[PDB]
Amino acid sequence: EQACDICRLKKLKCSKEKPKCAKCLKNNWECRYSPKTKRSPLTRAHLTEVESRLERLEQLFLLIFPREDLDMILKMDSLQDIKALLTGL
Amino acid sequence: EQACDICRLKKLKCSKEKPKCAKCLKNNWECRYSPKTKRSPLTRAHLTEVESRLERLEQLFLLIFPREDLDMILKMDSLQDIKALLTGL
DNA sequence: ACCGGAGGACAGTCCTCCCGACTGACTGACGTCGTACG
DNA sequence: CGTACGACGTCAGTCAGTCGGGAGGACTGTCCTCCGG
Ligand SMILES: [Zn+2]
Ligand SMILES: [Zn+2]
Ligand SMILES: [Zn+2]
Ligand SMILES: [Zn+2]
């Protein structure tokens, strides 16, 4: 089943043979089969672990700071910004 | 297709007839077909939105509580109590 | 009766991969200028 | 001097190649019902 890295990236049929394969072989490229990427399980128990801890950190957050701040953090991607937020106390 | 509240809790086969079904007519029972109860979507995109929020709060709380059992706190249910606690900031 | 879990239709993932559109390059054709000849 | 021919340059059109939206579909895991112990 698994297509080689390059065929994946390019989205063309892979011959998939061993070691290399038609277009990496032909075209002159180093053909690889990368490991599947580890992702979190998409189960319902796990979505619920995570929604319900996020909820409880939100509940605790609100005893400490205003709701308007909740909404800012819940969007920040930068670690300086998450820290500065906290520094304006 | 939908089974009745009761056949649902008792786990027996439901006749499904409306308004009152098999048993619920028999045992002269309060027969409800309660509406289809919502869950949040199990999709990858939504698992991931929620995991990004949780990470950001998780990070914000590493700085509020650099010292431990945040989990102790996360389990409490009382608002006064939690706030009595935190005022040991 | 009661309820753990089998059974199965279904929701949605998460792969590989075919196909269409868009961009770039190459070739051809036309037009304009310059030179040569009358 | 004037006209004609050739050569070069520029523009347009067509073809090919590549990134991309996403169809196809096996599969993971859900989430019902209700069997039978
Ligand atoms: Zn390949
Ligand atoms: Zn390859
Ligand atoms: Zn019923
Ligand atoms: Zn009923």
CSV table of C-alpha atoms (C1' of nucleotides) and ligand atoms in Angstrom, one decimal:
chain,number,residue,atom,x,y,z
A,1,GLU,CA,0.0,0.0,0.0
A,2,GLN,CA,2.6,2.7,1.1
A,3,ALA,CA,3.8,5.1,-1.6
A,4,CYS,CA,7.3,6.4,-1.6
A,5,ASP,CA,7.9,9.8,-0.2
A,6,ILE,CA,8.4,11.5,-3.5
A,7,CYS,CA,5.4,10.0,-5.3
A,8,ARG,CA,3.4,11.0,-2.2
A,9,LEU,CA,4.7,14.5,-2.5
A,10,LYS,CA,4.1,14.6,-6.1
A,11,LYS,CA,0.8,12.7,-6.2
A,12,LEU,CA,1.6,10.3,-9.0
A,13,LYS,CA,1.1,6.4,-9.0
A,14,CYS,CA,4.0,4.7,-7.2
A,15,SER,CA,5.3,1.3,-8.5
A,16,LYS,CA,6.1,0.6,-4.8
A,17,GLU,CA,8.6,-2.3,-5.5
A,18,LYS,CA,11.8,-3.2,-3.5
A,19,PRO,CA,14.1,-1.4,-2.9
A,20,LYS,CA,13.4,1.6,-5.1
A,21,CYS,CA,10.5,2.1,-7.6
A,22,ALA,CA,10.0,3.2,-11.3
A,23,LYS,CA,10.3,7.1,-11.1
A,24,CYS,CA,12.8,7.4,-8.3
A,25,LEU,CA,14.9,4.7,-10.1
A,26,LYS,CA,14.4,6.1,-13.6
A,27,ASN,CA,14.3,9.8,-12.9
A,28,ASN,CA,17.4,9.3,-10.7
A,29,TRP,CA,16.2,10.0,-7.1
A,30,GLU,CA,16.7,8.4,-3.6
A,31,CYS,CA,13.4,6.6,-3.0
A,32,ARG,CA,12.2,6.3,0.6
A,33,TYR,CA,9.4,4.8,2.6
A,34,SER,CA,9.0,7.0,5.7
A,35,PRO,CA,7.2,5.6,8.9
A,36,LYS,CA,3.6,6.6,9.3
A,37,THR,CA,3.2,9.7,11.3
A,38,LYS,CA,2.1,9.2,15.0
A,39,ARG,CA,-1.1,11.2,15.6
A,40,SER,CA,-3.4,11.2,18.6
A,41,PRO,CA,-6.2,8.6,18.5
A,42,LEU,CA,-9.4,9.9,17.2
A,43,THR,CA,-11.7,8.1,19.6
A,44,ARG,CA,-14.5,9.5,21.5
A,45,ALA,CA,-12.8,8.6,24.9
A,46,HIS,CA,-9.9,10.6,23.8
A,47,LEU,CA,-11.7,13.6,22.4
A,48,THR,CA,-13.6,13.7,25.7
A,49,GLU,CA,-10.3,13.5,27.8
A,50,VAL,CA,-9.2,16.5,26.0
A,51,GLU,CA,-12.4,18.5,25.8
A,52,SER,CA,-13.0,18.0,29.4
A,53,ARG,CA,-9.5,19.0,30.7
A,54,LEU,CA,-9.6,22.0,28.5
A,55,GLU,CA,-12.9,22.9,30.1
A,56,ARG,CA,-11.6,22.5,33.6
A,57,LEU,CA,-8.5,24.7,32.8
A,58,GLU,CA,-10.8,27.2,31.4
A,59,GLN,CA,-12.9,27.1,34.6
A,60,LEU,CA,-9.9,27.6,36.8
A,61,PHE,CA,-8.5,30.3,34.5
A,62,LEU,CA,-11.7,32.3,35.1
A,63,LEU,CA,-11.2,32.4,38.9
A,64,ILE,CA,-8.0,34.1,38.3
A,65,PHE,CA,-8.5,36.4,35.3
A,66,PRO,CA,-11.0,38.0,33.3
A,67,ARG,CA,-12.9,36.2,30.6
A,68,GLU,CA,-11.7,38.6,27.9
A,69,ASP,CA,-8.2,37.1,28.7
A,70,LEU,CA,-9.4,33.6,28.3
A,71,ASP,CA,-10.2,34.3,24.7
A,72,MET,CA,-6.9,35.9,23.9
A,73,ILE,CA,-4.9,32.9,25.1
A,74,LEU,CA,-7.1,30.4,23.6
A,75,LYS,CA,-5.8,31.9,20.4
A,76,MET,CA,-2.1,32.6,20.9
A,77,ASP,CA,0.5,30.7,19.1
A,78,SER,CA,3.6,32.4,20.4
A,79,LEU,CA,5.2,31.4,23.6
A,80,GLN,CA,6.4,35.1,24.3
A,81,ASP,CA,2.8,36.2,24.0
A,82,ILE,CA,1.6,33.5,26.4
A,83,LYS,CA,4.1,34.7,28.9
A,84,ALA,CA,3.7,38.4,28.5
A,85,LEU,CA,0.0,38.0,29.0
A,86,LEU,CA,0.8,36.6,32.3
A,87,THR,CA,3.3,39.4,33.1
A,88,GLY,CA,0.7,42.2,32.6
A,89,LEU,CA,-0.7,40.0,35.5
B,1,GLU,CA,-35.0,2.3,14.2
B,2,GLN,CA,-34.9,4.6,17.2
B,3,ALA,CA,-35.8,2.5,20.2
B,4,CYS,CA,-37.8,3.9,23.1
B,5,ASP,CA,-36.3,5.6,26.2
B,6,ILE,CA,-37.3,2.6,28.3
B,7,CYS,CA,-36.6,-0.3,25.9
B,8,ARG,CA,-33.3,1.8,25.6
B,9,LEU,CA,-32.6,1.6,29.3
B,10,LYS,CA,-33.9,-1.9,29.8
B,11,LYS,CA,-32.1,-3.0,26.6
B,12,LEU,CA,-35.0,-5.2,25.2
B,13,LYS,CA,-36.1,-5.3,21.6
B,14,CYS,CA,-38.3,-2.3,20.9
B,15,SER,CA,-41.5,-2.8,18.8
B,16,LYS,CA,-41.1,1.0,18.0
B,17,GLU,CA,-44.8,1.7,17.2
B,18,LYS,CA,-45.8,5.3,17.9
B,19,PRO,CA,-47.1,6.9,20.2
B,20,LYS,CA,-47.0,4.2,22.8
B,21,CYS,CA,-45.0,0.9,22.0
B,22,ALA,CA,-45.3,-2.9,22.9
B,23,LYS,CA,-44.2,-3.0,26.6
B,24,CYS,CA,-44.9,0.8,27.2
B,25,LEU,CA,-48.6,0.1,26.2
B,26,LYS,CA,-48.6,-3.2,28.2
B,27,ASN,CA,-47.1,-2.2,31.5
B,28,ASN,CA,-49.0,1.0,30.9
B,29,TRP,CA,-45.7,2.9,30.7
B,30,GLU,CA,-44.5,6.5,30.1
B,31,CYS,CA,-43.2,5.7,26.4
B,32,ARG,CA,-40.8,8.3,25.1
B,33,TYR,CA,-38.7,8.6,21.9
B,34,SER,CA,-36.3,11.2,23.3
B,35,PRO,CA,-34.5,13.3,20.7
B,36,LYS,CA,-31.0,12.5,19.3
B,37,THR,CA,-28.5,13.7,21.9
B,38,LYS,CA,-25.5,15.9,20.5
B,39,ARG,CA,-21.9,15.3,20.9
B,40,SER,CA,-19.2,17.3,19.5
B,41,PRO,CA,-18.0,16.2,16.1
B,42,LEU,CA,-15.5,13.5,16.1
B,43,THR,CA,-13.4,14.7,13.3
B,44,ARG,CA,-9.6,15.1,13.1
B,45,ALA,CA,-9.9,18.8,12.6
B,46,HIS,CA,-11.9,19.2,15.7
B,47,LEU,CA,-9.8,17.0,17.9
B,48,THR,CA,-6.9,19.2,16.7
B,49,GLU,CA,-8.7,22.5,17.4
B,50,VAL,CA,-9.4,21.3,20.8
B,51,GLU,CA,-5.9,20.0,21.3
B,52,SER,CA,-4.5,23.4,20.3
B,53,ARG,CA,-6.5,25.2,22.8
B,54,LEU,CA,-5.6,22.8,25.6
B,55,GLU,CA,-1.9,23.2,24.8
B,56,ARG,CA,-2.1,26.8,25.1
B,57,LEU,CA,-3.8,26.8,28.4
B,58,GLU,CA,-1.5,24.0,29.5
B,59,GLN,CA,1.4,26.3,28.8
B,60,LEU,CA,-0.2,29.3,30.5
B,61,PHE,CA,-0.6,27.2,33.6
B,62,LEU,CA,2.9,26.0,33.6
B,63,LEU,CA,3.8,29.5,34.4
B,64,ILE,CA,1.0,30.1,36.9
B,65,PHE,CA,1.7,26.9,38.7
B,66,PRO,CA,5.4,26.1,38.2
B,67,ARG,CA,5.0,23.9,41.4
B,68,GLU,CA,2.8,20.9,41.2
B,69,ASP,CA,-0.3,19.1,41.6
B,70,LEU,CA,-2.2,21.4,39.3
B,71,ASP,CA,-4.1,18.1,39.1
B,72,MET,CA,-5.0,18.4,42.8
B,73,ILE,CA,-6.6,21.7,42.0
B,74,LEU,CA,-8.2,20.5,38.8
B,75,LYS,CA,-10.2,18.0,40.8
B,76,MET,CA,-11.7,20.3,43.2
B,77,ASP,CA,-15.3,21.4,42.8
B,78,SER,CA,-15.7,24.1,45.3
B,79,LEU,CA,-15.4,27.7,44.2
B,80,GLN,CA,-14.8,29.3,47.6
B,81,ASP,CA,-12.3,26.5,48.3
B,82,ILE,CA,-10.4,26.8,45.1
B,83,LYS,CA,-10.3,30.5,45.6
B,84,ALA,CA,-9.1,30.2,49.2
B,85,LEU,CA,-6.3,28.1,47.9
B,86,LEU,CA,-5.2,30.3,45.2
B,87,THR,CA,-4.9,33.2,47.4
B,88,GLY,CA,-1.8,31.3,48.5
B,89,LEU,CA,-0.3,32.9,45.3
C,1,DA,C1',-35.2,-8.8,34.9
C,2,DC,C1',-30.9,-6.9,34.0
C,3,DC,C1',-26.8,-5.5,31.6
C,4,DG,C1',-21.9,-6.8,29.2
C,5,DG,C1',-21.0,-6.8,24.9
C,6,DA,C1',-21.9,-8.7,19.9
C,7,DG,C1',-23.4,-7.2,15.9
C,8,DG,C1',-23.6,-4.1,12.3
C,9,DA,C1',-24.8,0.2,9.8
C,10,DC,C1',-22.5,4.4,9.6
C,11,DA,C1',-19.5,8.5,10.3
C,12,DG,C1',-15.3,10.3,9.1
C,13,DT,C1',-10.0,9.3,8.3
C,14,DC,C1',-6.5,9.3,5.9
C,15,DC,C1',-4.3,7.0,2.4
C,16,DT,C1',-2.9,6.7,-2.9
C,17,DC,C1',-3.6,8.8,-7.1
C,18,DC,C1',-6.3,10.2,-11.5
C,19,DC,C1',-7.5,14.5,-13.8
C,20,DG,C1',-8.1,19.3,-14.9
C,21,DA,C1',-6.4,24.0,-15.0
C,22,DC,C1',-2.8,27.3,-15.2
C,23,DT,C1',1.7,28.9,-16.3
C,24,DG,C1',5.9,28.9,-18.8
C,25,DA,C1',8.7,28.0,-22.7
C,26,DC,C1',9.4,27.3,-27.4
C,27,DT,C1',8.4,27.8,-32.2
C,28,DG,C1',6.4,30.0,-36.0
C,29,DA,C1',4.7,33.9,-38.5
C,30,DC,C1',4.4,38.6,-39.5
C,31,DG,C1',6.1,43.2,-39.7
C,32,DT,C1',9.6,46.5,-40.0
C,33,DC,C1',14.1,48.2,-41.1
C,34,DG,C1',18.3,48.2,-43.6
C,35,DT,C1',21.0,47.3,-47.5
C,36,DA,C1',21.8,46.6,-52.2
C,37,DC,C1',20.8,47.1,-57.0
C,38,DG,C1',18.8,49.3,-60.8
D,1,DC,C1',16.8,58.0,-55.0
D,2,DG,C1',13.4,54.5,-54.8
D,3,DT,C1',11.9,49.9,-54.6
D,4,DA,C1',12.4,45.2,-53.4
D,5,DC,C1',14.2,41.5,-50.8
D,6,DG,C1',16.1,39.4,-46.9
D,7,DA,C1',17.0,39.1,-42.1
D,8,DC,C1',16.0,39.9,-37.4
D,9,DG,C1',13.1,40.7,-33.6
D,10,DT,C1',8.8,40.6,-31.2
D,11,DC,C1',4.4,38.8,-30.2
D,12,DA,C1',1.1,35.3,-30.1
D,13,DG,C1',-0.4,30.6,-29.8
D,14,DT,C1',0.0,25.9,-28.6
D,15,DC,C1',1.8,22.2,-26.1
D,16,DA,C1',3.7,20.2,-22.1
D,17,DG,C1',4.6,19.8,-17.3
D,18,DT,C1',3.7,20.6,-12.6
D,19,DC,C1',1.2,22.0,-8.3
D,20,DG,C1',-3.4,21.1,-6.5
D,21,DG,C1',-8.3,20.2,-5.4
D,22,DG,C1',-10.0,16.3,-4.2
D,23,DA,C1',-12.4,11.3,-5.8
D,24,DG,C1',-11.9,6.8,-4.7
D,25,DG,C1',-12.4,3.7,-1.1
D,26,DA,C1',-10.2,0.5,2.5
D,27,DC,C1',-10.5,1.3,7.1
D,28,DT,C1',-10.7,2.8,12.0
D,29,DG,C1',-13.6,3.6,15.4
D,30,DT,C1',-18.6,5.2,16.6
D,31,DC,C1',-22.6,4.4,18.5
D,32,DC,C1',-26.8,2.2,18.0
D,33,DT,C1',-29.9,-1.9,18.9
D,34,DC,C1',-31.0,-5.8,21.7
D,35,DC,C1',-29.2,-11.0,22.3
D,36,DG,C1',-28.7,-14.5,25.9
D,37,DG,C1',-26.3,-15.7,30.2
E,1,ZN,ZN,7.4,5.8,-5.5
E,2,ZN,ZN,10.4,6.4,-5.1
E,3,ZN,ZN,-40.0,0.6,23.1
E,4,ZN,ZN,-42.0,2.7,24.6
